[model samples]
Target chain A: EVQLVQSGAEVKKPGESLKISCKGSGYSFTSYWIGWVRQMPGKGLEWMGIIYPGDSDTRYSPSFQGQVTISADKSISTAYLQWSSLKASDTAMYYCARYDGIYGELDFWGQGTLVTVSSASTKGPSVFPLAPSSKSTSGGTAALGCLVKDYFPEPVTVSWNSGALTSGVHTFPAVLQSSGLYSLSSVVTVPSSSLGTQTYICNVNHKPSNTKVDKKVEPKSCHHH
Target chain B: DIVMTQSPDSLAVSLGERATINCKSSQSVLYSSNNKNYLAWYQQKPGQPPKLLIYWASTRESGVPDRFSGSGSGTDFTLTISSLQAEDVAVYYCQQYYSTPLTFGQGTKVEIKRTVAAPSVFIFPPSDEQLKSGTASVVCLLNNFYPREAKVQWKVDNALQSGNSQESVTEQDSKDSTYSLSSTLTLSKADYEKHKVYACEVTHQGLSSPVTKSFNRGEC
Candidate 1:
């Protein structure tokens, strides 16, 4: 039987940095890659990214390009997801999942850890991870929300408008509450008409940048508290 | 992220026949990874529990019969039922955990068609106060053991009680008309009792036998 356990719950705010962990034990940690998923408080599940402890190979959901950081410590058999800033919208449950698709379909599952983000500085940034406003529409406005948990100091960014900012919408702030718990949140009211068809991402960077991002900034990590 | 949608979220299966299901994902998960394309299948028979059936695209999960097999890759997957035995009536599902968000396909129901003359149900355990952790709680079980098509149910006192009603559907080891089912009801914490009668009823071709198994409640 394969199993995975997450660290803890977290509460955060905008601007503060945070980190979370998913400790793998039952199976060979370094053997397979561990991925992350986001579930908003009552919403559905969203894929974030996957990280291999052996070679440190990482893949994001395209939805998570410059929003967060995902890494692993093979020596300890644990994967991490983190952020640099926090926002009130980044509130939800973050779960660490081991991809059992060694063959073709999913075989196992993991219970989730909740991360709550509030407006006040005490509550912190906690929510679900979602696809960036993939497209802009009517009105030069693009409305969107992100769900992250047990993380702070959001790693992603957002620019006001016009293919101007090389990163996400803004570099909001986030915070990690307690010991291991934390989360990230972000929202960009972009110019829907112009940004239409342009992809918005809640990226997760890795331990080594490796020039993954050029004029852009970068990361994936898991939640513990 | 592949999305799977099943037809007739509910249905009836005729014993000695067959029940088939289709699972389709959003995108092709078949990629040159380590080796094989990670694919899996599961079964949720009525009144019992969910069991793993086909895996790794087509391999059977230990104990599973040859009647069950999986085919297809990437955007489409198929789960076939060799022969529809009475017991082989319940819900079926397909999932892909190889990628992200561990996707689970919608569930499909498989039930047998009612014959002319048949027994109503197989078994029904009580759902009275079950004692758990020094307290009393109630748990129930419902099983339909009909050699052919039949409907099974569990009623606690009067109202239809609920908890964990599982159904397992598979080939009837050469027994064409033979079928089996198992569903359980649970009370929180945990406790045991002897005497309290719980009802388990089956509905089949005009035949109905509501079995009330009474048990003693001990230690919550």
Candidate 2:
């Protein structure tokens, strides 16, 4: 039941100061030492340092000694890693772990926090054509889905026909993929009676890349009257 | 390398007891598209090649015993033997095939409880010739240990000494299948002469307390 909840992802500009946190719960946090580990994009893990929360005693790896600061607040059951100034190379995923002092093992870990420094060129979303749901043709209502994938920065706008129809449109939160990109699906429901006649257009606007992609689909009728 | 590390270097379980081994990867081994973890587990016994016990993290290999099971996803995984049998006494390993330079966990040895053999420890102090060279070393020999694992420590006058000792590779006796190893602790002749006591402590599962043998410089 021991849990280490880390802070959310961060986007910072170069020279900005940033401090992220990992809060421990469901166990006696002060009794155990907490450590930080870093993983650059597509790279191996690097041990940063460890802190004994009870006494605030901290140790850092030679490579990270002067680069970052590790601290903990025993009362809050939380540990923090901070940097005075961010560099482009500081962008990486950071994880906090509970260290077993005896064996020097990291026995428990937190979900990672991704830190992105500097604004890189965005990857535009790939918009796929709307596909009708399985029940679209048989039921009274038709559910059309548009998939937008492989986008960066998580800010892509999905609209139906340039926002002409806003009702019945639902856009899910963008999901971060393993490839460090984002994907999401937008669904719009319409009347099945309009099948084969009405052409539905799904548009995706990626503002960072200043790119717009649109896909058109026409639901086919399941029954011929 | 996607490092894979396993927990509990060794386990001692009674008959019909559950034995569990945990393996963790540096990065996620689960391939999201296929929804499969590129992780496998193997069991190895003396004088035989490792047998694939589980693959894809949780699938028991064909012809393998049903008591063995694997579970977990992404970076963390576990291999469980629901009922440990006499034949299951061996070293278990976990491997990751998600990336190049495939990595494997340090093997975890499982032994049946009550079968551990205590090790006989002896200390050999540096000879006069060695002291004449201005550098001397003490050797701790461990013999007749079962399960092939032991913890050796060198202490100078009750203070623990770290990193100055080197342990030899363990060798198993062909006749009895027990393990033997030696650890050498090197120190300056001046420090060796000044220290009143040098001790070597051996800890094993077979012993209720660590076995310690001391070398008194004055007695020498």
Candidate 3:
């Protein structure tokens, strides 16, 4: 019944400082070790570091070295991941996991905490609609893609909601632009029966300015083969 | 840092069938000083964190079902499921603890495989004088099992018992690479009349039915 409860989600501007916490219970807190992992939007998990609360011994993955800080306070049975100057690219979900001392296996995991970094200084990502592409769609299906360009500080969450077309939605991983910004897209394939009449909707959330970029589409008949 | 890669990224299996996943590390994870590999295997189901199934290459974590086993060393390793169950659908990953920047294999997804190996069974009977002292030590030994995994359970009057059984870690036989495990069952003279049968039942994927070796108190 060991439990590791994480702090709530956060929204901050670039260069703002933030520190998140994970409190452990139902077991000997200081006896074992705790580790951290990061998952960016649409990205796989990355091992960050580990901390032994009992002796304050800490180790960081070379990939994450010098990027963040990991700390713990045994007296309170809590571990912390702190940032002194956050980047927009730092927006991600963070998780804490318990480790078995014998082999450093991550056995128990904490619920993820989402941290969003946005600022008024940065411009909103440019949103543009694209004509439906049928090259990758066939068999009574129509494909559509939404392009988001020149997004600064990286990831921008994208989602699609089109009236019941029996379709699947997919978002490609963001591509880094030469200008140090980001380029990303979300695509959906709709069944022929629901095409030409349904409204395809895309919602982009940027927490800094409380901006919610919503776009809609009315499908047109299209085919590749 | 060691890079781990799994083959056949995904596969469908049937109940009672065997599923084998292979993992190769870019470098050896073996520690020559202790003769133990720092590799471990994990099972991660949808919406869940990975569960450690094996460590040190072949040691099963407590409570892991015997159906799951790990083998190989240095750079090449395998995680085998003797019989795939409906609940076994998930991604399996391999990891190395030999150095920093710890990394995991991309993972192999196993679907239900519809279907699915043996060992030498031995029993060590307590000495005659020790049997009368109100307590006896009965040991069950299973040796040279292929696919390197098996389950050993103690039974008293046909009922399963685990509270007082001490089991040994699975050990590999270099002579042939097969593995074996042994468990000691404790017997209290007070609970036995003179002809009680204490059976050790072993379930292995190689055999359709469980293998049993019974010890009679009277014979002791």
Candidate 4:
């Protein structure tokens, strides 16, 4: 029945200050300790810090020592993570866990809170298929295009249905649109004959929003007289 | 911080049998000043958080059953389950709190070794109440299974339909000391009206082949 309920998601601009909370219940909160973990979009878990609510004694991971602040209010059974100035790189899912001081293990966890920092609001990438190149219809190599657009906080990965491409692939750097969003294009070349018969899928992995968009490209006929 | 290593990564014990797990720390956890060993034991059920079972090496938590016992001293410790119950199947871990960055031992999983009874697989058609509620659903029940590990799947017209189905947590019957589980498959109203053949397939170690139970819309 032990639970760590965390604050709701927050969307903040770079350089702004913010504080998130995790409230513990269903047990003697002061008797145990609480810790924070960070999962930067698509990255592994990183320990931030742990605080003993009873005495407010806190410890931080060497890597996170000066990057964030961890504090607790024993009376309200709540822990806080604060940042003086948010950076675009600070976007991640933060989890609060009950650290059994006796066992030194995180026994209970809170549903993660997503913190997004960008000049614009957070948005997922939308993928669109572009028309095949003219050379493809003339019996040469076929060039298929995938346009990923309107995403914020700019780290995205593009892949083909066949997996990571080593050659015959070109990906352009993300371009900031006037709307404050970003867009990018990736193109892959394959034999022209495979256009109508085979299916090619473009996958855009947008980690910040935890979304993967797949655009299926299947041409009716790529052969022209 | 002391490193904790557990022996026998896994154990297979029959129902009503005894299971033992050992943990050895790199350094002594006995605090001379307090005359106590700073050690604890925990049990974790599948898909659930670890539950504290014992602390101070041998002191049982307030509500933990008597079947669980912790012993030993210094760097070596043991966790013993006197009589393994069906629901007692879980992973046990040992940890030392005498130092900072409290470290826990690699968990030891306790599984039911063998059982004579095979699981009873049944498919329950959606009730009339569900129909009135604009829902088309079917239930698959697996009862009296042993080892507590089974794969349940739903198929439509013999084609595997992995999505749109949810499995409930496994539960044990106190009276029979056996396990039971249920899975719900949500079907489209269009498919239900078309009288499609829905089947629930269960695969367990006790059976040579998977057991399947079918429910046809026409039959109901």
Q: Which stretches of candidate 3 lie over 4 Å from their true place?
A: A118-225, B112-220
Report the C-alpha lDDT of model 3 over B90-130, residue by residue, as the tens digit: 77988887876777888887764222237656555443444
Per-model chain B TM-scores are 0.52, 0.56, 0.51, 0.70
Specify the poorest-scoring 10-residue window by lDDT in model 3 chain B. B169-178
* Span of 10 residues, lowest total lDDT, candidate 4 chain B: B168-177
Q: Rank the candidates by DockQ, best first.
A: 3, 1, 4, 2
Clashes of each: 147, 0, 13, 0
Q: What is the DockQ for all candidates, taken in turn?
A: 0.05, 0.01, 0.08, 0.03
Of the true interface contacts, what fraction does each candidate have? 0.13, 0.00, 0.21, 0.05
Candidate 1 lDDT by residue in tens digits, B1-220: 5676665675666655666778777777676675444567766542222456887667877778878888887767788887776566657877675665456666776766654444212221221211213322222212223444554465544457554343333232223333333333433333224234445555554454544433322211
Chain A TM-score compared with the true chain A, each model in order: 0.51, 0.63, 0.63, 0.57
Alpha-carbon RMSD to native, per candidate: 24.0, 30.3, 27.9, 18.2
Judged by lDDT, which candidate is best? Answer: 2
Query: What tens digits encode model 4's per-residue C-alpha lDDT throughout A29-49?
Result: 888889887766634345578
lDDT of 3 by residue, A1-225 (tens): 889899977878889899999999999898998988887764456789998898889988888889889999988999999999999899888989898753566778887788878763454676555334323333676555455555655447777763343235545555554456565555555665555566787777655334567776444333443
- Candidate 2: tens digits of C-alpha lDDT, residues B182-210: 67677788888888898999999889999
- Model 1 regions lying over 4 Å from their true place: A11-18, A41-44, A86-90, A100-106, A119-225, B1-4, B8-20, B25-38, B41-54, B61-69, B72-75, B80-220
Q: Which candidate model has the greater DockQ, 1 or 4?
A: 1
